[PDB]
């Protein structure tokens, strides 16, 4: 069993049911529960990321992956400034629209801010 | 008569003959003589420009016109920096090659540096 909500013991399957795919509602209606130090908790602590097949928090290989949840599931990038808002992101939860008409040293600037994105869900 | 070379009196026609169209040789072999304060002199003093039909130096309406003689008779403008080298020019003696691939606020920057050019001899 695992320690839950600082008062009861629950099994893996319970923690797993909570975790599973609260489809949309990221903003107060999901968390996606994880296992860490025999506790079933809302999210991995700092320095940890979630090993997917077993809900288990494991320490990060270098800096932790960073999931960026977009407002309304979308974001339009039309400048270096808007691209910067995604700096450090490795996972985009949503969809991206690229609308860049001008500027300077864009390939390097865009690579600095968007070069770490590994996945886009939309 | 006019005062010439600080020792003799010469007539208008003499000053005019000196002035006339020493075709090329701008760099030590021309000057184009002018009239100022009853002197026939190599060039207009600061604040004056030459009224063309009578060789007479007249005070400048605002800043004075500026002749820019190009090295080898040409110049390639490929940046804001190279354009700046022509800032203030009203006459180009030579030919211009424009090769601008990128940058920012170019229309304003180029107009600031090249917007006063009235004539190109090549």
Interface residues of chain B, partner chain A, Cβ below 8 Å: 102-104
Residue B4: count of CB within 10 angstroms of its CB:
17
With contact defined as beta carbons under 8 Å apart, do A58 and A35 qualify? no
For B67-104, letters b (16+ CB in 10 Å) and e give ebebeeeebebebbeebeebeebeebbeebeeeeeeee
CA proximity to B16, closest of B56, B45, B47: B56
Residue in A closest to B104 by C-alpha = A103
| Distances B76 to A119, B24, B85, B99, B110 between C-alpha atoms, Å | 46, 21, 11, 7, 14
Instruction: Give the span between the Cα atoms of B69 and B48, in whole angstroms.
Output: 19
Q: Is A13 helix (H, G, I), strand (E, B) or coil?
A: helix
Instruction: Give the span between the Cα atoms of A112 and A87, in whole angstroms.
Output: 7
Q: Is A69 helix (H, G, I), strand (E, B) or coil?
A: strand
Residue A89: count of CB within 10 angstroms of its CB:
21
Residue B28: count of CB within 10 angstroms of its CB:
6
With contact defined as beta carbons under 8 Å apart, do B58 and B44 qualify? no
Instruction: List, in sequence order, every beta strand (DSSP E) within chain A.
Output: 2-4, 8-10, 34-36, 39-41, 48-51, 56-59, 67-77, 91-98, 119-120
For B60-93, give the DSSP string. Answer: -SSSPP-EEEEEEEEEEE-SHHHHHTTTT-SEEE
Counting every residue, how long is chain B?
122
Give B61's Cβ-side CA count (13 Å radius): 2
Residue in A closest to B102 by C-alpha = A104
Contacts of A9 (CB under 8 A, 6+ apart): A1, A2, A3
Distance from the Cα of A105 to chain B's closest Cα (Å) equals: 9
Instruction: Give the span between the Cα atoms of B25 and B30, in whole angstroms.
Output: 6
- Strand partners of residue A49: A58
Instruction: Give the span between the Cα atoms of A2 and A11, in whole angstroms.
Output: 6
For chain A, the straight-line distance linking the first and the last C-alpha, in angstroms and rounded, comes to 36
With contact defined as beta carbons under 8 Å apart, do B69 and B27 qualify? yes
- Chain A partners of B102 at a C-beta cutoff of 8 Å? 104
Q: What is the resolution of this structure in A?
A: 4.4
Task: State the count of interchain CB pairs (< 8 A) between A and B.
Answer: 5
- Chain B partners of A102 at a C-beta cutoff of 8 Å? 104
Tell me how far the alpha carbon of residue A90 is from its chain's centroid. 8
Q: Residue B35: which H helix or E strand, with range? A: strand B34-36
Q: Is A7 helix (H, G, I), strand (E, B) or coil?
A: coil
Backbone angles phi, psi at B72, to 5 degrees: 65, 15
Distance from the Cα of B106 to chain A's closest Cα (Å) equals: 12
Interface probe, candidates B100, B102, B109, chain A, greatest A C-beta count within 10 A: B102
Instruction: Give the span between the Cα atoms of B9 and B26, in whole angstroms.
Output: 26
Q: Is A42 helix (H, G, I), strand (E, B) or coil?
A: coil
């Amino acid at each position: 069993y695992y320690h839950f909500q600082d008062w009861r013991c629950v099994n893996f399957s319970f923690c797993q049911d909570l975790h599973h795919k609260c489809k949309n509602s990221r903003r107060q209606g999901c968390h996606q529960y994880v296992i860490h130090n025999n506790k079933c908790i809302p999210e991995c602590p700092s320095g940890y990321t979630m090993n997917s097949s077993n809900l288990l928090c494991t320490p990060c290989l270098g800096p932790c992956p960073k999931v960026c949840h977009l407002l309304e599931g979308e974001k339009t990038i039309d400048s270096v400034t808007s691209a910067q808002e995604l700096r450090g992101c490795t996972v985009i939860n949503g969809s991206l629209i690229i609308n860049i008409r001008g500027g300077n040293n864009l390939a390097a600037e865009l690579e600095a801010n968007l070069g770490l994105i590994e996945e886009i869900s939309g």
